[PDB]
Amino acid sequence: SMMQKLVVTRLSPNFREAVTLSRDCPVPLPGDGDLLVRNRFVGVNASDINYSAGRYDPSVKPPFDIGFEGIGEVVALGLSASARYTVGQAVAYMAPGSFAEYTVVPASIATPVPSVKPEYLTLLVSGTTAYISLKELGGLSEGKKVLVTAAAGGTGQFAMQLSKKAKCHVIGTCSSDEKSAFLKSLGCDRPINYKTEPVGTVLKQEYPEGVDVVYESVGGAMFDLAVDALATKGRLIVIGFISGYQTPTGLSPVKAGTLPAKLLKKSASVQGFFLNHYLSKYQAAMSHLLEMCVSGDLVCEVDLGDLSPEGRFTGLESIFRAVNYMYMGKNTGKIVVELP
Amino acid sequence: SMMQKLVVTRLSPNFREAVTLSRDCPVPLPGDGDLLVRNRFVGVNASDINYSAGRYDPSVKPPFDIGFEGIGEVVALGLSASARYTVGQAVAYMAPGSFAEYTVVPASIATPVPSVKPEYLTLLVSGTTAYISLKELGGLSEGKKVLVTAAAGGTGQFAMQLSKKAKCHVIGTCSSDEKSAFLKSLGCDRPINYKTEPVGTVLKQEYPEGVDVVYESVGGAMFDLAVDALATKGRLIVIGFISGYQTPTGLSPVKAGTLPAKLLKKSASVQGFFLNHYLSKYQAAMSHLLEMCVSGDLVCEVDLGDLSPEGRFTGLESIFRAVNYMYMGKNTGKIVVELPH
Numbered sequence: 001s002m003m004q005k006l007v008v009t010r011l012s013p014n015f016r017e018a019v020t021l022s023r024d025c026p027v028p029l030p031g032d033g034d035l036l037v038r039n040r041f042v043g044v045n046a047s048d049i050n051y052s053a054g055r056y057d058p059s060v061k062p063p064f065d066i067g068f069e070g071i072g073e074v075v076a077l078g079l080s081a082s083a084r085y086t087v088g089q090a091v092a093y094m095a096p097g098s099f100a101e102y103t104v105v106p107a108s109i110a111t112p113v114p115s116v117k118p119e120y121l122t123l124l125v126s127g128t129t130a131y132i133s134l135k136e137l138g139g140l141s142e143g144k145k146v147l148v149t150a151a152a153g154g155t156g157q158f159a160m161q162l163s164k165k166a167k168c169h170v171i172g173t174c175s176s177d178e179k180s181a182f183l184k185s186l187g188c189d190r191p192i193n194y195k196t197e198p199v200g201t202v203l204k205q206e207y208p209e210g211v212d213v214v215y216e217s218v219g220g221a222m223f224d225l226a227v228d229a230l231a232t233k234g235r236l237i238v239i240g241f242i243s244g245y246q247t248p249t250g251l252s253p254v255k256a257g258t259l260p261a262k263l264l265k266k267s268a269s270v271q272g273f274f275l276n277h278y279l280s281k282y283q284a285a286m287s288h289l290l291e292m293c294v295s296g297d298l299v300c301e302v303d304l305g306d307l308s309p310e311g312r313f314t315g316l317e318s319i320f321r322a323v324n325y326m327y328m329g330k331n332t333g334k335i336v337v338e339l340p
Numbered sequence: 341s342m343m344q345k346l347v348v349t350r351l352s353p354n355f356r357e358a359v360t361l362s363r364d365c366p367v368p369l370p371g372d373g374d375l376l377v378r379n380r381f382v383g384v385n386a387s388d389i390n391y392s393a394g395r396y397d398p399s400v401k402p403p404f405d406i407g408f409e410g411i412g413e414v415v416a417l418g419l420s421a422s423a424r425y426t427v428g429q430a431v432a433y434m435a436p437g438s439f440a441e442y443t444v445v446p447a448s449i450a451t452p453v454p455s456v457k458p459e460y461l462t463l464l465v466s467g468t469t470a471y472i473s474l475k476e477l478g479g480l481s482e483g484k485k486v487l488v489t490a491a492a493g494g495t496g497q498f499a500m501q502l503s504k505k506a507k508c509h510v511i512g513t514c515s516s517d518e519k520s521a522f523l524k525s526l527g528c529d530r531p532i533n534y535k536t537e538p539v540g541t542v543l544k545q546e547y548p549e550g551v552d553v554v555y556e557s558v559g560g561a562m563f564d565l566a567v568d569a570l571a572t573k574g575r576l577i578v579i580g581f582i583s584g585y586q587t588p589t590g591l592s593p594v595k596a597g598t599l600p601a602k603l604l605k606k607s608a609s610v611q612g613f614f615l616n617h618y619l620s621k622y623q624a625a626m627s628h629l630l631e632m633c634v635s636g637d638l639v640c641e642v643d644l645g646d647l648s649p650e651g652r653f654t655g656l657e658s659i660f661r662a663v664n665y666m667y668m669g670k671n672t673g674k675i676v677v678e679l680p681h
């Protein structure tokens with residue numbers, strides 16, 4: 001009857017500053033097309049702080065709901081919805097307002113899953129971004145060289161594995177030897193711990209002919225280095241620029257004045273990807289990801305914060321600590337919060 | 341005998357200060373697989389001043405030859421070359437050192453043409469660049485919105501027409517009402533004189549959903565504006581940035597600190613194109629352009645300087661005048677120089 005949820009109360013890229021835990025909120029009811037989902041696991045996303053900062057609709061003022069993705073059970077559903085879905089059914093979704101004990105979700109955008117496991121939630125945003133971007137924009141083929149940044153992260157792990165399944169040679173960047181060992185176990189050809197080995201040196205000394213594809217999530221100096229490392233007809237996909245999201249503009253500084261000249265001289269491209277522009281591809285991607293997840297052909301690494309200082313990310317209140325864990329570079333795989 | 345040719349004697353983007361007219365040069369002799377071409381028309385190219393600046397191979401010291409393209413008669417040729425070519429035959433080529441009375445050209449890269457006309461020379465660099473870039477990178481299809489910058493120039497006129505033949509809606513920028521009237525005669529849907537109409541405002545008011553493809557060859561403020569005007573999944577092709585080539589570095593200033601953010605938010609791309617990376621496509625492009633030019637299906641506008649202050653661009657010495665004419669923005673169509681004989 002009553003539930004907790006996170007609410008953006010003030011526009012800020014600092015999540016603690018922007019977001020309030022409300023305690024005594026009414027449990028909303030599903031429309032005729034709508035499911036009501038008991039959230040069991042919610043995904044933490046780099047762009048949670050872009051959403052809290054208001055960078056999606058700068059018209060929209062607080063208060064508003066937050067959280068992009070959830071997995072759980074249908075507890076209620078409208079009549080139309082009850083054609084395809086039933087109460088107690090395991091479902092996952094990508095829709096704003098997952099950071100709640102219960103969320104209303106249009107049946108038309110729900111993904112049926114085999115059970116409530118956090119591994120299936122890793123696919124909804126992180127998996128589908130890597131799958132659709134690389135398939136529509138990567139032009140991957142046997143022997144291509146792929147650089148993946150934030151390679152041991154939520155979406156990074158999927159860029160790494162999908163590139164390997166395409167029989168590419170894969171380089172992955174990360175901030176620890178533990179993360180390097182994770183990348184090697186995923187079949188990464190050249191893991192780089194950029195804390196102990198300068199990435200620019202590795203690419204100069206081991207990849208003098210450069211790389212065909214960059215899955216670039218980090219921005220700043222990592223972007224500039226990826227541009228310099230492009231082969232003739234190379235493709236840098238701008239997945240994100242996490243290094244800038246905490247700043248007041250949300251932008252990371254890049255050497256952009258000489259960029260059009262570098263791309264002309266290499267016949268090379270910088271291509272942006274936003275998942276919400278490729279929804280016509282989402283169903284097929286999520287189906288193929290699930291088949292690989294269930295079969296064990298795809299590692300779907302989940303970071304529930306068990307080895308963090310204050311331990312497992314349990315409850316809505318743990319989302320503040322889980323966002324900080326991400327921005328401290330501490331996670332291996334997808335950061336997930338459990339609502340028990 | 342002896343001949344005249346232009347030589348780069350000093351690296352600089354200032355063409356007049358980089359390039360000397362030699363008068364005492366020996367006519368080179370063709371090898372077994374070579375043509376010796378007597379140049380009748382030579383092409384002037386925005387990037388002649390990047391070449392004189394040494395920006396292509398920054399290892400190569402002066403002196404070296406210059407000029408990218410020629411059309412003329414085979415006056416001598418090697419025995420193996422005589423399998424495909426005959427003395428007296430009309431040929432065109434894209435190879436360095438066209439700015440000479442006579443140029444040695446491998447038979448393997450020469451294009452046979454129906455006669456020595458300047459219209460055919462327009463296709464070699466300007467025509468093939470627009471054709472190959474838009475076919476390989478444009479994703480043109482019916483109803484796509486195409487913005488062409490320098491649309492009344494050498495390559496611009498082809499980007500404009502080839503986009504109209506792909507059934508696209510086409511916007512063209514140029515600096516005069518005469519140039520705007522030339523664009524309207526090519527079927528341009530929306531000529532813009534950017535001197536008398538703010539381009540940014542036209543695009544915002546008349547194309548609020550944005551443009552699907554930009555053929556961008558100007559750089560600077562025009563590049564910034566083109567990025568802002570891109571539709572969702574829009575494609576900006578960097579053909580060039582002529583606004584920068586006279587500068588010490590050859591670069592034009594852009595306000596592109598936010599470029600990655602804008603491309604991510606629109607799922608849009610910025611794609612470089614260099615003709616020399618796509619030579620496996622050149623022969624098919626040139627064959628198709630030639631068919632359309634001979635049939636009258638394609639306007640191949642030539643600017644021989646007949647309405648410039650000092651009149652027709654005649655002789656190698658007129659190349660200095662022809663380059664200044666381009667960089668003053670005066671030309672309609674391809675700037676060609678005639679070497680009469």
Ligand SMILES: NC(=O)c1ccc[n+]([C@@H]2O[C@H](COP(=O)([O-])OP(=O)(O)OC[C@H]3O[C@@H](n4cnc5c(N)ncnc54)[C@H](OP(=O)(O)O)[C@@H]3O)[C@@H](O)[C@H]2O)c1
Nearest residue numbers: 045046150153154155174175217240241242243273275329
């Ligand atoms: N375009 C789209 O539709 C879309 C969708 C999903 C995600 N993304 C993007 O993908 C990227 C990764 O997001 P995610 O949610 O999956 O997170 P994540 O990669 O699981 O975690 C972020 C990782 O990035 C690195 N990092 C953190 N703070 C950093 C900083 N200040 N500077 C540099 N590196 C830093 C750290 O790994 P290291 O050990 O490697 O340093 C950290 O583990 C983000 O840019 C996000 O916006 C975009």
Ligand SMILES: NC(=O)c1ccc[n+]([C@@H]2O[C@H](COP(=O)([O-])OP(=O)(O)OC[C@H]3O[C@@H](n4cnc5c(N)ncnc54)[C@H](OP(=O)(O)O)[C@@H]3O)[C@@H](O)[C@H]2O)c1
Nearest residue numbers: 385386469490493494495514515557580581582583615669
């Ligand atoms: N990527 C490749 O392989 C390749 C191959 C060929 C050509 N290109 C590029 O295509 C572009 C056009 O070259 P082109 O030889 O065909 O010349 P063009 O367009 O026939 O002549 C240049 C035109 O650009 C405009 N312009 C000239 N100086 C300018 C300046 N300082 N600032 C702004 N606009 C200026 C003028 O037209 P307006 O009336 O419109 O101002 C002028 O008529 C250049 O960037 C060239 O490098 C590239």
Ligand SMILES: Cc1ccc(-c2cc(C(F)(F)F)nn2-c2ccc(S(N)(=O)=O)cc2)cc1
Nearest residue numbers: 047050055056057239240249250251601605
């Ligand atoms: C300054 C700035 C700009 C973009 C982003 C960003 C990152 C991401 C994502 F998806 F990569 F995670 N999206 N995303 C984003 C995407 C679309 C919009 S939109 N539709 O309001 O213009 C707004 C933000 C962040 C900060």
Ligand SMILES: Cc1ccc(-c2cc(C(F)(F)F)nn2-c2ccc(S(N)(=O)=O)cc2)cc1
Nearest residue numbers: 265387390395396397579580589590591614
């Ligand atoms: C600083 C700078 C550098 C390059 C150019 C430019 C323009 C053009 C052209 F042909 F497209 F018009 N090419 N072109 C160019 C392209 C590639 C090379 S290369 N040999 O390094 O790959 C060399 C020159 C302009 C300014």
